[PDB]
Structures are given as C-alpha cells and as structure tokens.
Amino acid sequence: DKTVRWCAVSEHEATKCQSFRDHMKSVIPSDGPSVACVKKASYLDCIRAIAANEADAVTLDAGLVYDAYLAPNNLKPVVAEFYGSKEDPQTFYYAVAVVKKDSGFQMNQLRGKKSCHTGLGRSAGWNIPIGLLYCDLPEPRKPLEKAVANFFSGSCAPCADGTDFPQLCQLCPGCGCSTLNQYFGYSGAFKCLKDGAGDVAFVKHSTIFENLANKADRDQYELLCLDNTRKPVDEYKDCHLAQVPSHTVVARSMGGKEDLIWELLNQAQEHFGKDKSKEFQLFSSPHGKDLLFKDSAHGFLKVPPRMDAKMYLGYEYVTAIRNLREGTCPCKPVKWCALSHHERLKCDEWSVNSVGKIECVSAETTEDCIAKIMNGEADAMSLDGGFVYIAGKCGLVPVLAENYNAGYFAVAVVKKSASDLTWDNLKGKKSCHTAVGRTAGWNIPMGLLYNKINHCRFDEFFSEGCAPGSKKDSSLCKLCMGSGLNLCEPNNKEGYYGYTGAFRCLVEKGDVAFVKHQTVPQNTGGKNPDPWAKNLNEKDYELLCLDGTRKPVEEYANCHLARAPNHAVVTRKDKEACVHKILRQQQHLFGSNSETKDLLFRDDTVCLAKLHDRNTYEKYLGEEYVKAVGNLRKCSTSSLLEACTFRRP
Numbered sequence: 001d002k003t004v005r006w007c008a009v010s011e012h013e014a015t016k017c018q019s020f021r022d023h024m025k026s027v028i029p030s031d032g033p034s035v036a037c038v039k040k041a042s043y044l045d046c047i048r049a050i051a052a053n054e055a056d057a058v059t060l061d062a063g064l065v066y067d068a069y070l071a072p073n074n075l076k077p078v079v080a081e082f083y084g085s086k087e088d089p090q091t092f093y094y095a096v097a098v099v100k101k102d103s104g105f106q107m108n109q110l111r112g113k114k115s116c117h118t119g120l121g122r123s124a125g126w127n128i129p130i131g132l133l134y135c136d137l138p139e140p141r142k143p144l145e146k147a148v149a150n151f152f153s154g155s156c157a158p159c160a161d162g163t164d165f166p167q168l169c170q171l172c173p174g175c176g177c178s179t180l181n182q183y184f185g186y187s188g189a190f191k192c193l194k195d196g197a198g199d200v201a202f203v204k205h206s207t208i209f210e211n212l213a214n215k216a217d218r219d220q221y222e223l224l225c226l227d228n229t230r231k232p233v234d235e236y237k238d239c240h241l242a243q244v245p246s247h248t249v250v251a252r253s254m255g256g257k258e259d260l261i262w263e264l265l266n267q268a269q270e271h272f273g274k275d276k277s278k279e280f281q282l283f284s285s286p287h288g289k290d291l292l293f294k295d296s297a298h299g300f301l302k303v304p305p306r307m308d309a310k311m312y313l314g315y316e317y318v319t320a321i322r323n324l325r326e327g328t329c330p331c332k333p334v335k336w337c338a339l340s341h342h343e344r345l346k347c348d349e350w351s352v353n354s355v356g357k358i359e360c361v362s363a364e365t366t367e368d369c370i371a372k373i374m375n376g377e378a379d380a381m382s383l384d385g386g387f388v389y390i391a392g393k394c395g396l397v398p399v400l401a402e403n404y405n406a407g408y409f410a411v412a413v414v415k416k417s418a419s420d421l422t423w424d425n426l427k428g429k430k431s432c433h434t435a436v437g438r439t440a441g442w443n444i445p446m447g448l449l450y451n452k453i454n455h456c457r458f459d460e461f462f463s464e465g466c467a468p469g470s471k472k473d474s475s476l477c478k479l480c481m482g483s484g485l486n487l488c489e490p491n492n493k494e495g496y497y498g499y500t501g502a503f504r505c506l507v508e509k510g511d512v513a514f515v516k517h518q519t520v521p522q523n524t525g526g527k528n529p530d531p532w533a534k535n536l537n538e539k540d541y542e543l544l545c546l547d548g549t550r551k552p553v554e555e556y557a558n559c560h561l562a563r564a565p566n567h568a569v570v571t572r573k574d575k576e577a578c579v580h581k582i583l584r585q586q587q588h589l590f591g592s593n594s595e596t597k598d599l600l601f602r603d604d605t606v607c608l609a610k611l612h613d614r615n616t617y618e619k620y621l622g623e624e625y626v627k628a629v630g631n632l633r634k635c636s637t638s639s640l641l642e643a644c645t646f647r648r649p
C-alpha cells in the first residue's frame, strides 16, 4: 500500500483526518496515496509515533519542529504551509527588534533599556529575544522572569508574574494577558514602542507595516541587527532576530515517506484547497479551528530535499531555543572543515601545531561543509568564488582572501595547431571545464557566453565536453575520464576535474579549456611529470582573446576573459571578527617561511588578505560576477543553493 498515516492530536483533528481520508479515496486512483489516521494525545506523542514508525506525518509549529529533530526522534521538514498568495507565498515570518530612530543603542546594549513584548511565552515577543539574550542575563538565570526583570530596567511583558517581578509590568501595570491591556499582543507591543513607553519592541516583521500605513512614519523606526548595527524596517530580511517557519509537515529523516506525503498533500490541495468549493475543504473545518493545518493556509510547498531541521529553522532560531532548553553558558577554537582524508590529515597536524586554536571536522562534499558552517558544526573553510556565491546566498560571509601574488586571470586555452579556433564562435566545439559552478571553469566563461546566446543550455551549444558536475547523461560529461560512478564527478576521482584536469582534457580530447592564467605554465615543460603532461611545451598552446585574436600563453595580461575573485575563507557573521584574528596569527607563524595538491588552501597562495568593506559576497565578488551567476542558475542543479533560495529567494 501507499498509505500515509497522518497523526492527529485531538478528537476533532481525528474526525477531520477521517473525512480527509474518505474524500481522497474518491479523487485518487487505486495506485495512488491513501490516508490513515492515527490519534495521539499531544504533538510530542505524534512525534514519537512517527519516529517509532507508527505514523508518517504531522504539522508542527517551529518549536516542535526543533523537538522533532532532536534524537532519538530525528524527524525532518518535508512540506511547508504557505500563506498570502500563490504568486508570493509566505512560508516564514521574521522576529525583529524595532527601535526608534536615533535612540543610540545596539543589540548588545539592551541591558537597562525598556522593553515591550507581545507576551510572555510567545515566539517573536519572548522566546526568541530572551533565547538570544540568555547568556547576557544576570545570574542566576533561573527563574527566567526574575533574570529578565533584572536585565531590562522596566518592561511590558504581558502574562508575566508582576506580583513577584513588578519590573516586568512597569509599562503595563498588571501585565494583563488579554486585549484589555493596550500593550498586549502584536500591535500592543509595537504601540508600547510607538507611544514611547519602551525603547524596543520584540515583534514580527509585519507588525510595523500593519500599524503604520505611510512610509514617512516608518522612517522614524529601525531594526536591531545581530551584528550590532541598525537597518531600516523594510530590510528585515538582512536584519532580524530569527526566521521562523509558520507550519511545517515533518517526517522521518530515513524511511520517509516524503515522496508519498507530498503527492498526497499536493493532490489534496489541487482538489480540496482554497477556492475549490467542494463539500470537503482541507484548510477549514466546521468544528474547531486549525485542524491538521492552519485555517489561514493557502496551500503547500515542497521543502527542498537537501534541507534538515537546523537549516530549515535557521542558525539564529536554533541558538535561541537551545539556550532556553539547555540553559548553558560559558573566542574558542576555529573548527575547520575538510573535504578529504588527505585534506583532513593536513588539518589534523595543523590543529596539533596550533596548540588547540584550530580544530578539524570533516565532510564528503563542499556543500556538506558549508551546511556545517551554517549550523555551527564547522566554522571556516576556503572556497572558490563560485562556492562563495553559494555560501553567501546561504548566509555566510567572506573574511579573508587567498592572495596569489585583484585576483587570478580566467583564460581560454586552445592548441596552437588549431588555427581556426576563435572566441567569437566556438559553437560545436569540445569544451573542458574545471567544474560547473566554479569561477574560472564556468562562471566567467559561460557567463560571457550567456550574453551572446542568451540561454544556459551549453550542452546544446558545445558538441560535447567535460564539465564535472553536469548531469551524467549530458553532452558535457562525454569527454570526462572517470570510471564507474566517478565519471563526471566534481571531485578528485575524475581526472579531468580542476584547473589542471581541464587542461589535461584539452590535451587529450577537447578543443578549448577554461582555466586560469598559471595552469598551462605549471603543467608544461616537464614541470608536471605525469605522462600526459611531461612532454608538452607551452608554445604549442594559445589563449583566446575577447577580441577574437589569439596570443601566447604567458601573454595572459592582455588576452584574458576576466579577472577572477580570489578564493576566500567564509564563516558565520558571529565568528567573522574572531576567525579574522586567529587566522592572521596562524599565518604569521606558519605562512611564507600540501602533501598532495591544494589541500585546504591553494598552493599558489602567499597570504590571507583582509577584505575591508568587501566583507559580503555581493561586494567581494562584484556586481558583474553576481549578475552573471544569476543568469546561469536558471540551469543550475545545486541542491544546497535550492535549500537556501527556499528561505531567501
């Protein structure tokens, strides 16, 4: 059977599910998914039932998405409720800290200020801000209300115990837990800031726009960013305390059945969703509110498969709730992320010489390591600019750049004997790329190509090629040399992968190789001893100019495709200042004074350079680079980038 066992937490919910089950039987053919209805006492009990393989799916608020993820449950987000509109689905809200313009303080100066909360126990108004501020609170932090009352000088915290902690109700005497209190709820907390009672209101990003219709009034307000800067109120996506998903269907991380859950729910919304007007309605029910799904929901979005719960909830949210759950409070060592056994070994002996200031964690791919930097399992790694773009879109920032000598040169290599080849038309030729998504092998050359053909189907433009990372059936995998499952892989087990791998591809099979200005000189004239390169001379290879002319290999200064952004080390914003300092000290000791090749850092690198204002992927890579990659992701297959685009489109 293809049965999805839905888990209900009430008798009203069990009745709706049973109607859900019966109406779907009349719309789904017998080969399709069917509903079973399991009834438990609580959301916690449904989470355990799903982990125990007694049910398959339940819909949770963000806090319970966190609980469902913790061992031994290990549930995973799989389907999202969206709200608003099909054109602009709203899946998340943003908990923000609004302040009045020019009040003169930052997020790390909240102690002693006057605070306005929507209500004790609520997400944006209490659990997230107090979760983030937890270790800032005075000891003993238990009971929490007493610690908060001795952190803010006065507050309006609706539903707090004002009898025992009267500071919490200075701005709303009694801490009235209903609309009879003018500072209660989401507008109440913002009104507590507007009327001048408090200095800061902890609310949702939309409260400001629903209580202040005209932008002129809104310009008198700002938001507190976690980097201790302020931003305007409509920049909440770059300046919030946490991004919170409203209502998430969860499932077992292994054993699913994600596939079945989505095709059940997606069919259900197409026949019984909003505006479908049948006798059964998925997002309503005659008896009781919000049964199985929120009554305000407008449909379902499939959660991208790369995403786990920590990535879905976000780093900020997870920190806040873990602080409240665990209550644990201490620059600490920088945990580098390695991609190989050989790369891990280099880090290991680096860690032991750094006397603890460096630690090592491992992952199988670059994307896995990036996800570990995002969620805190890892801290830093050095990335090609193409991965810096991905790391940036996923919330990470560049901190230092590898300097090889303004960065390296992306050039197009051809064989000198091929007199006909020109940059103006290489259509129908055989291409060799370092990998899809990398700076010199893909983003620079194919970005320029996109401008003169205006599409991303480069396997239909070149006859064939080796572009490691392309889909195994593609014209651009046919020239690759990996065997078995390694054919066309963007790793070492594919011999045409990388700067020199793409040059070898040109030497043996291809017509053009997109690499960097030093690749040909380092792999010719006997410098590379491998049989494929040993007997090559660099005078038999030329560079393709943008002109349409050609020049010798070491004339790259005036025959390049573009200047490339250097590889850079990326990190979280909260670890930027510290990663900057530890790495500056460690290269003073182990710098200019790899067992295999280019492990952790490229071997051309001389120093790790500071970046000044170019501390953002948009400012580090440049407007031209980012616009070109935006053009190319119309054909990108990056699962990590898909997960990060789902949270920040």
Ligand SMILES: [Fe+3]
Binding pocket: 384, 385, 438, 439, 440, 567
């Ligand atoms: Fe590169």
Ligand SMILES: [Os+3]
Binding pocket: 012, 287
């Ligand atoms: Os009833």
